Design a protein around this ligand. Structure first.
Ligand SMILES: CCCCCCCCCCCCCCCCCC(=O)OC[C@H](COP(=O)([O-])OCC(O)COP(=O)([O-])OC[C@@H](COC(=O)CCCCCCCCCCCCCCCCC)OC(=O)CCCCCCCCCCCCCCCCC)OC(=O)CCCCCCCCCCCCCCCCC
Ligand SMILES: CCCCC/C=C/C/C=C/C/C=C\C/C=C\CCCC(=O)O[C@H](COC(=O)CCCCCCCCCCCCCCCCC)COP(=O)(O)O[C@@H]1[C@H](O)[C@H](O)[C@@H](O)[C@H](O)[C@H]1O
Ligand SMILES: CCCCC/C=C/C/C=C/C/C=C\C/C=C\CCCC(=O)O[C@H](COC(=O)CCCCCCCCCCCCCCCCC)COP(=O)(O)O[C@@H]1[C@H](O)[C@H](O)[C@@H](O)[C@H](O)[C@H]1O
Ligand SMILES: CCCCC/C=C\C/C=C\CCCCCCCC(=O)O[C@H](COC(=O)CCCCCCCCCCCCCCC)COP(=O)([O-])OCC[N+](C)(C)C
Ligand SMILES: CCCCCCCCCCCCCCCCCC(=O)OC[C@H](COP(=O)(O)OCCN)OC(=O)CCCCCCCCCCCCCCCCC
Ligand SMILES: CCCCCCCCCCCCCCCCCC(=O)OC[C@H](COP(=O)(O)OCCN)OC(=O)CCCCCCCCCCCCCCCCC
Ligand SMILES: CCCCCCCCCCCCCCCCCC(=O)OC[C@H](COP(=O)(O)OCCN)OC(=O)CCCCCCCCCCCCCCCCC
Lengths: 57, 318, 469, 76, 171, 108, 86, 183, 89
């Protein structure tokens, strides 16, 4: 059976701190900010061609 | 005469520039959020993007009212720039009822959303324009109600009076939940995409959009965060300068505008930063979020503030 | 203790279901009864026409106003004892006369709006309270939304009440422009001589008066009364009349008024000759409302009209209330039922009612003789005491036209009896189910007041003498 | 599923229920009730124990209620 | 008692005070000096100011025409105080209102030249600042140490003069 | 001629210029709704308009000490019961028919 | 590490508002003759600033100081006429 | 400088013009667009007279809420409307030409207190006289207009704010009384 | 008093002499309240008091709640019908 409100391990105040202060919103905000500070994947086309095989057609 | 026309020249030209460089800043930072180069560059040549696509945007097709709503949307977005102060007592027009004006123009800004749906009408497109209008007014409520609970500590409708009151402590640090809910109500006035069902002559809506972006950033910056205030800086000057001179007033106006622009720039970056990370809302979720859950908290914060001013002496004098 | 009721019940009705509405109205009924029983010792506050100004020159509490303040709760108990209680326990009588969820809220908001006029001193309490009660009539009318006539009626009443509200606000603004104060006692009998005020004070009067049915503009109200359902209209015909008429009578701003005397005559003419050739019962009944609300601009012309007014208002409210409750009883015996909201529409429909039961026609006969001023009834002394004041203060042609109006009006009061005592051909021999006990005891009590109020006439005059002089 | 127990079928259990399942109406009504209830219980404790109330500001020029004793000086 | 118009048109009147009101020595001080010397002309000329507002009270509506005698004497004694503060402490008075001409004439921003001026005037001219209506066990606000409300820029000349008054020991 | 008024004269000129350059450079050439949509705007007005009843208190909060406090508290506490009316009655929620009503399969 | 091309737009926006506000404070100090502006102006303060304009002679807030008034100070006092406001 | 004199009579003429464009328009939205023009001509007059606070309150609630309300209604509703044709509206002209004269002259009558009925009207126009504005130095704090409204609504007229609560209460209950259809 | 009387009289005759739609009635009713305000506020200014402004700030609110109520009355009228008629209710 899915557990009710009263068979929950955390308090209602502890749950409301996650509810009002957007606990996992800032986590996903932090992930995209981590991606802001690393070196991108992008390549110049008319002056560099991507990696190819000998069996290419 | 010449004394003030050069002054409004400098201000209009600076704000007109800054709104255009935001259209480049958003493309760049969302490029590096997703590991692309994005636009090639950002310099003095860097406006020639936003210039060039602002030119080419005037080359497509459109299919008396259609003339008026982009116009009134842009002039409503542009007249609200006087009333922000940029330094102590520096306004383009000084008025004791600046928040009442700022509030009346946040009220005037809704009309272009109505009159845009009339042009090239369908049944379903008209309904969609209705939905964008109703979310715009719905979050305008909580905007206005928190303006009240900020000026409860000031008890004055002047804006430099707010910031000079704010000198001892910013209003953001006691009322931190208020900062959080204002930031989301601030990306709610605008159509920023956590809050953008109802999107997903055009040059005026395009310009006035970013002008509203940076202008509600200004409205955050003076009343919640410190407006032009960074620190006390009384001690550094007594070592640098010997007496008041035009160099000294230049240096202080410079550091005050720097402290204002850093607030506005970090907040403006956070708008584009909250754009990328989240998907958008169902409209029922939008209205439900505005009314049923957030606004009872708003009545509660509204009752808990005067009672806290009541428990101590602490009523603010005009 | 209205707002102690309203604030409580609005939270109580917000959470209760649609089936609970009857028992909610029963609770509010018993609450109003005990507010009248346990708190009616406040008559002792005045003993020599002592008047209090409360909330700082804003409300005015005297004894005329205490009597109207008690009268409105009493009639509201009789009205709320209708929606609380079933008429019969049948399928028809459940699908007829259904109370909406928000109806019991809007009644008490209207009583707040009606009480804050009779108690009112300032013009701003006047304006806010006419607005509160005008909204409540806009929404008591429109709450039966799934009715074509009721929605058209609420939309008409909206714009006509809006014009007369702006006319009142213009008069209030104009009196403010010629004199700095808002209160009516800034007049204090030295202004009016040295100041042309006649045009302002009449336009303030005529603004409220046209909201009630003063007869150049009588055509819209008759249409609203005929179009609403038959239970909204007993309330929205009683309440705004008595509330503003006791305002305009408490504060005698138009004495010797020629405009008021003309429109009084025009009311007594067109009401008594308008009701003559009319086949719908709520029509006939609303022009009986019109002539009787035009024995009112008469007392409004007078000075010192507080025996004639108060006696005639409680006369009229009991008589009004009783005859609507008679035709609400009469709908069971009729052969044809149309129009679920408004079940009896024609006065042709209540034929042969004496062969169905005789005592409901005995009741109907005493009320219809009380409207036409038949002397052993309580409705007689109302016209007697109007005429002991009309002639007292010099209105002689008014008295003759009053008499002729009463005689022309009796011609369409007696049509109710001419219809109701006739042969029907299909008599009732046995009804299986009987009408609700308390809801017929209320009508029996309202009869015996009408037929036996001359007993206590003399006590009332002595009591009156003490407590208003 | 979590259903309504009722405020009348145990108050404290109902407040514990509403704190978990409807925190947008518990912690909104409980932050707004902590104002007018704390204004009736925490103010005399302050006026006795922390500091008493302030002296009122003047609003107009403060006229005394004397009868002009005759001043001497600054004649010409 | 009223705020000006749509289109108000200013005018003056080249005329004279007619016959019987003598000539007077009116205050030619601007907002900064008389805002600076406000407590001292309030401390010396208390009963004359009191007497003028009392006389204006007792002649209700007569008013302006009635106490020409006596608004003559509040001007004379206020001019007396400010001539005395000129000849007494022109340098430190000037320091205080050259401070107070910035900072919106907020009194909050100029404690430093203020306390120097108050020592100078209490020494030579023996008048003292009081905030009346202030019950005891309430510190007056221009005496407290580490206030919450500090100015933006302490002006330079009063920093120097206050430091030299510390070094001399007169403060 | 102050510096406030050139700005709100000069901006409609800027808009007219950005509009006339658009007219110079461009190419040219009932369904039923739900009650919640109408109700959001109809009901928005009595909640926008108590805010402006709240605007004169917030300026004069010092003068009405201890007394205008309680008047404003009672004003707001009368408004909260109409708020709890609309949130008890589920007024803004829009509903649909996606449930199969979850009736158990009854045989014979 | 940090991207410089991402931060140059915000650097330009920051520098634009910075140079704007510095120019603004210098223009205000040049108009007033070396003193900062009055941001909150009472009715009292407005009447007082008009009296200062009347006292010092022509210039805005010169803030002169004298033991007495000049003889022209008695006669230059103005009353404001005002249209009918129909 | 006396270009800056006729500013009130200008806005009076503009209000006349603007109501002529209210009651003569093709679309139902064109009429409310000239209506928000009328609100802003009014707010210019209210600033002009000496009331800067009100003009912005009129912008906040009259081209604020109730504008958006009416624009909104005219969007999501269909409303048939005819044009101002001469064949359906010239029949009203000899009543309008009487009622204009009578209602304007009578609305300019009650500002006077004589008893001649021609000296009553001629006191409405015989006012070209310039009020003289003195400076009194009695006021010490900037109690502007909004402070005094907040002092009078809250102490002297607290009951009007407290009945006003019931009116706004009713403005919330009413649309839910009607437009819901519970169950 | 000219601008208020003119808005009141002309808005009144715009109310009275329509036969084309229902919304011109609403907006002429709203501009009548504006016309009453334009007279009241100038009598507040010229007499030097707030009490006409007191009645002004009250009648702003009553015009607001009036519009809220009356447009819910119109949606009642429109729900049951199909299309609001040209000639009127
Ligand atoms: C201080 C201590 C801290 C504060 C107290 C902390 C708790 C606060 C109360 C919590 C609110 C109650 C509640 O159930 O939660 C939310 C409640 C939800 O209830 P629910 O469980 O969802 O209902 C669903 C059931 O199916 C529906 O069940 P139901 O049908 O049974 O209805 C439930 C009930 C739910 O409502 C309640 O139960 C609350 C009732 C409490 C009323 C009294 C509270 C105020 C106490 C004042 C104390 C004064 C002394 C202070 C002295 C201090 C001195 C220093 O609603 C009602 O029955 C109607 C309300 C009746 C109110 C009667 C008020 C008038 C008489 C009382 C005042 C008399 C004064 C006389 C003076 C005048 C003389 C002229 O939310 C609301 O509906 C709004 C509450 C409105 C309160 C009024
Ligand atoms: C809603 C939309 C709102 C519209 C607003 C625009 C206009 C609003 C104004 C209208 C407002 C509504 C008008 C209501 C009707 C006006 C009421 C009215 O007539 O009082 C008139 C004023 O005697 C004029 O001097 C009346 C003379 C008035 C001037 C006549 C008009 C000039 C037309 C030129 C052609 C008199 O009354 P009244 O019977 O008490 O007066 C009597 C009588 O005069 C004396 O003989 C008696 O001795 C004395 O006892 C006294 O009581
Ligand atoms: C208000 C009342 C008056 C309105 C007009 C005013 C007149 C002035 C004052 C009058 C004073 C009124 C006093 C109350 C009188 C009390 C009283 O006689 O018992 C009641 C009337 O009870 C009300 O009907 C109660 C009356 C209404 C109150 C409703 C809530 C209780 C008499 O019913 P009843 O025996 O025939 O009812 C019988 C009887 O109860 C059983 O045989 C059956 O159970 C039942 O079905 C029915 O057949
Ligand atoms: C035990 C209760 C059981 C439940 C009953 C619930 C409601 C009963 C409601 C009404 C019953 C009738 C009471 C009438 C009181 C009149 C007071 C009065 O004549 O008013 C006079 C002045 O009137 C007037 O100007 C003229 C009014 C003319 C009335 C015309 C009709 C009267 C004929 C029948 C009425 C009398 C019948 C008596 C039946 C035994 C003021 O005196 P007052 O204000 O001090 O009287 C109230 C004192 N009190 C509250 C303690 C009772
Ligand atoms: C659209 C018109 C609506 C008018 C809105 C009024 C805007 C406003 O708030 O003006 C305030 C401002 C001065 O107000 P205040 O706070 O007292 O200034 C203190 C100075 N230290 O006022 C000003 O400085 C200038 C006023 C600008 C408003 C221009 C309206 C002129 C109307 C002319 C009619 C032409 C037709
Ligand atoms: C002190 C005593 C009381 C203690 C508690 C503290 C109360 C004070 C705090 C008040 C501040 C409240 C902030 C806003 C509350 C948001 C409510 C919420 O997040 O959840 C409710 C709502 C969904 O409603 P529901 O049906 O209940 O969903 C259940 C799912 N858990 O969720 C939603 O509909 C949307 C959820 C996302 C909201 C939009 C997100 C905007 C993204 C911005 C995030 C912040 C970005 C910051 C950027 C700069 C950071 C450096
Ligand atoms: C600390 C102790 C005090 C805490 C008391 C908390 C009570 C919590 C109220 C509550 O239970 O709310 C939830 C409940 C929802 O009802 P539900 O069963 O979910 O079905 C309908 C949903 N619309 O009930 C509801 O319907 C919500 C109704 C209440 C909404 C309150 C929000 C309005 C703002 C309140 C401001 C504070 C007022 C406080 C009173 C001040 C005067 C004392």
């Amino acid at each position: 059976r899915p557990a009710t409100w009263e068979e929950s391990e955390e308090g209602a105040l502890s749950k409301a701190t996650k509810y009002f202060l957007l606990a996992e919103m800032f986590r996903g905000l932090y992930v995209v900010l981590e991606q802001f500070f690393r070196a991108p994947y992008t390549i110049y086309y008319p002056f560099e061609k991507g990696p190819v095989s000998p069996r290419f057609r | 005469m010449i004394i003030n026309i050069v002054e409004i020249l400098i201000f209009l030209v600076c704000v007109l520039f800054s709104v255009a460089y935001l259209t480049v800043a958003e493309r760049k930072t969302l490029a590096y959020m997703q590991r692309r180069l994005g636009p090639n560059f950002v310099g003095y040549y860097g406006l020639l993007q936003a210039f060039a696509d602002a030119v080419k945007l005037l080359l497509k097709e459109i299919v008396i009212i259609l003339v008026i709503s982009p116009l009134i949307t842009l002039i409503t977005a542009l007249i609200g720039w006087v009333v922000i102060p940029l330094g102590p007592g520096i306004t383009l027009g000084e008025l004791n009822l600046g928040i009442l004006f700022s509030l009346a123009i946040g009220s005037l800004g809704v009309f272009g959303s109505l009159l845009s749906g009339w042009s090239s009408n369908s049944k379903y497109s008209l309904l969609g324009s209705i939905r964008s209008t109703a979310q715009l007014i719905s979050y305008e409520l909580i905007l206005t109600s928190i303006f009240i609970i900020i000026i409860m500590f000031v008890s004055s409708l002047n804006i430099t009076t707010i910031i000079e009151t704010q000198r001892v402590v910013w209003y953001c640090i006691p009322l931190l939940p208020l900062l959080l809910i204002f930031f989301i109500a601030s990306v709610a006035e605008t159509a920023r995409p956590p809050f953008d069902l109802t999107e997903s002559p055009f040059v005026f809506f395009f310009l006035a959009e970013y002008s509203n972006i940076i202008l509600i950033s200004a409205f955050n910056g003076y009343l919640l965060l410190g407006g032009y205030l960074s620190f006390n800086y009384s001690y550094l000057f007594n070592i640098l300068f010997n007496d008041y001179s035009y160099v000294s007033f230049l240096f202080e106006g410079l550091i005050n505008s720097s402290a204002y622009a850093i607030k506005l720039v970090f907040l403006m970056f956070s708008f584009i930063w909250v754009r990328a990370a989240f998907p958008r809302f169902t409209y029922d979720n939008l209205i439900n979020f505005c009314w049923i859950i957030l606004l009872p908290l708003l009545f509660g914060i509204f009752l808990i503030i005067p009672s806290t001013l009541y428990i101590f002496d602490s009523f603010p004098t005009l | 203790m209205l707002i102690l009721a309203i604030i409580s019940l609005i939270t109580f009705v917000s959470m209760s279901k649609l089936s609970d509405n009857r028992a909610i109205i029963r609770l509010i009924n018993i609450y109003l009864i005990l507010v009248l029983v346990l708190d009616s010792f406040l008559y002792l506050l005045f003993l020599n026409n002592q008047t209090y100004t409360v909330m700082g020159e804003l409300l005015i509490f005297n004894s005329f106003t205490f009597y109207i303040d008690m009268l409105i709760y009493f009639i509201m108990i009789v009205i709320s004892s209708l929606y609380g209680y079933n008429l019969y326990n049948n399928n028809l009588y459940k699908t007829l006369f259904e109370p909406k969820k928000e109806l019991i809220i809007l009644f008490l908001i209207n009583i707040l709006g009606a009480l804050l006029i009779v108690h009112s001193n300032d013009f701003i309490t006047l304006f806010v309270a006419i607005e509160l009660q005008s909204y409540s009539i806009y929404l008591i009318t429109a709450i039966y939304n799934s009715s074509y006539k009721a929605s058209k009626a609420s939309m008409l009443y909206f714009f006509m009440g809006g014009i007369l509200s702006i006319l009142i606000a213009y008069s209030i603004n104009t009196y403010y422009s010629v004199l700095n104060s808002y209160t009516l006692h800034s007049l204090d009998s030295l202004i009016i001589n040295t100041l042309d005020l006649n045009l302002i004070l009449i336009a303030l009067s005529l603004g409220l008066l046209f909201k009630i049915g003063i007869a150049p503009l009588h055509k819209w109200l008759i249409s609203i009364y005929e179009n609403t359902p038959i239970l909204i209209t007993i309330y929205i015909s009683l309440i705004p009349k008595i509330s503003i008429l006791s305002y305009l009578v408490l504060s005698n701003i138009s004495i010797n008024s020629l405009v008021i005397s003309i429109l009084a005559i025009l009311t007594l003419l067109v009401g008594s000759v308008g009701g003559l050739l009319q086949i719908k019962i709520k029509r006939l009944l609303a022009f009986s409302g019109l002539t009787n609300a035009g024995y009112m601009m008469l007392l409004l012309l007078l000075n010192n009209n507080e025996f004639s007014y108060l006696y005639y208002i409680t006369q009229y409210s009991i008589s009004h209330l009783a005859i609507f409750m008679i035709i609400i009883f009469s709908i069971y015996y009729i052969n044809y039922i149309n129009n679920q909201y408004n079940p009896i529409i024609y006065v042709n429909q209540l034929k042969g009612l004496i062969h169905d039961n005789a005592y409901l026609v005995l009741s109907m006969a005493i009320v219809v003789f009380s409207f036409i001023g038949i002397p052993p009834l309580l409705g007689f002394f109302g016209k007697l005491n109007i005429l002991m004041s009309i002639l007292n203060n010099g209105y002689y042609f008014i008295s003759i036209v009053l008499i002729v109006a009463s005689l022309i009006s009796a011609l369409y009061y007696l049509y109710l009896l001419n219809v109701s005592i006739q042969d029907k051909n299909n008599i009732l021999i046995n009804s299986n189910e009987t009408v609700s006990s308390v809801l017929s005891y209320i009508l029996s009590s309202l009869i015996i007041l009408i037929t036996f109020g001359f007993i206590y006439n003399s006590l009332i005059i002595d009591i009156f003498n003490v407590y208003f002089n | 599923i979590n259903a309504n127990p009722g405020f009348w079928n145990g108050p404290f259990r109902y407040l514990r229920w509403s704190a978990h399942n409807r925190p947008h109406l518990f912690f909104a009504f409980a932050i707004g009730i902590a104002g007018p209830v704390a204004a009736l219980t925490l103010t005399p404790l302050r006026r006795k124990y922390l500091y008493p109330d302030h002296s009122p500001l003047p609003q107009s020029y403060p006229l005394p209620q004397r009868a002009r004793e005759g001043l001497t000086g600054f004649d010409d | 008692p009223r705020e000006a118009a749509a289109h108000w048109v200013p005018f003056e009147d080249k005329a004279n005070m007619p016959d019987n009101v003598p000539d007077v020595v009116e205050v030619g001080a601007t907002s900064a000096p008389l805002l600076s010397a406000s407590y001292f002309i309030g401390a010396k000329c208390k009963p004359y100011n009191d007497d003028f507002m009392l006389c204006r009270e007792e002649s209700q509506g007569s008013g302006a025409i009635d106490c020409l005698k006596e608004g003559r004497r509040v001007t004379r004694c206020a001019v007396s105080v400010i001539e005395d503060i000129n000849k007494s402490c022109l340098d430190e008075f000037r320091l205080h209102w050259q401070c107070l001409e910035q900072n919106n004439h907020q009194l909050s921003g100029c404690r430093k030249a203020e306390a120097l001026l108050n020592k100078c005037v209490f020494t030579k001219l023996n008048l003292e600042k009081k905030i009346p209506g202030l019950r005891p066990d309430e510190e007056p606000v221009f005496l407290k140490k580490d206030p919450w409300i500090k100015p933006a820029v302490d002006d330079f000349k009063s920093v120097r003069a206050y430091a030299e008054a510390k070094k001399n020991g007169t403060l | 001629m102050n510096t406030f008024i050139i700005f709100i004269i000069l901006i409609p000129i800027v808009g007219f210029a950005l509009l006339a350059v658009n007219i110079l450079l461009a190419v040219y050439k009932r369904l039923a709704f739900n009650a919640a949509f109408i109700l959001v705007a109809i009901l928005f007005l009595p909640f926008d308009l108590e805010i402006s009843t709240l605007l004169p208190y917030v300026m004069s909060i010092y003068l009405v000490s201890n007394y205008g406090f309680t008047i404003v508290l009672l004003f707001l506490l009368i408004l909260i019961i109409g708020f709890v009316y609309e949130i008890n009655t589920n007024a803004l929620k829009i509903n649909k028919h996606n449930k199969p009503n979850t009736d158990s399969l009854i045989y014979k | 590490a940090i991207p410089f091309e991402a931060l140059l737009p915000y650097g330009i926006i920051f520098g634009l508002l910075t140079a704007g506000g510095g120019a603004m404070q210098v223009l205000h100090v040049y108009r007033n003759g070396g003193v900062r502006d009055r941001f909150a102006i009472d009715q009292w303060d407005s009447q007082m600033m008009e009296r200062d304009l009347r006292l010092n002679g022509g210039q805005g807030r010169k803030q002169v100081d004298q033991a007495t008034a000049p003889e022209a100070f008695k006669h230059n006092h103005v009353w404001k006429s005002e249209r009918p406001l129909i | 400088m006396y270009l800056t004199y006729y500013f009130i009579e200008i806005t009076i003429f503009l209000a006349i013009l603007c109501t002529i464009f209210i009651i003569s328009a093709k679309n139902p939205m064109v009429s409310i667009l000239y209506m928000i023009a009328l609100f802003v001509i009014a707010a210019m007059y209210l600033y002009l007279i000496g009331l800067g606070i009100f003009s912005l309150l009129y912008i906040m609630i009259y081209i604020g809420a109730i504008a958006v309300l009416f624009l909104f209604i005219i969007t999501l509703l269909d409303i048939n409307s005819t044009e101002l044709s001469v064949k359906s509206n010239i029949r009203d002209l000899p009543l309008v030409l009487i009622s204009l004269i009578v209602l304007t002259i009578s609305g300019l009558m009650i500002y006077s207190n004589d008893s001649i009925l021609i000296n009553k009207l001629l006191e409405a126009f015989g006012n070209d006289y310039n009020t003289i504005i003195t400076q009194d130095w009695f006021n010490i704090e900037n109690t502007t207009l909004l402070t005094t409204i907040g002092n009078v609504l809250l102490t002297n007229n607290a009951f009007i704010l407290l009945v006003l609560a019931i009116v706004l209460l009713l403005g919330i209950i009413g649309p839910i009384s009607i437009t819901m259809k519970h169950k | 008093m000219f601008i208020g009387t003119i808005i009141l009289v002309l808005s009144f005759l715009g109310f009275v002499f329509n036969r084309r739609n229902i919304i011109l009635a609403f907006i002429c009713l709203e501009t009548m309240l504006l016309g009453i305000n334009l007279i009241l506020l100038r009598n507040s200014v010229l007499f030097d008091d707030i009490s006409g402004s007191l009645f002004a700030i009250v009648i702003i609110i009553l015009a607001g709640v009036e519009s809220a109520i009356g447009l819910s009355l119109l949606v009642s009228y429109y729900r049951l019908r199909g299309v609001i008629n040209s000639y009127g209710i």
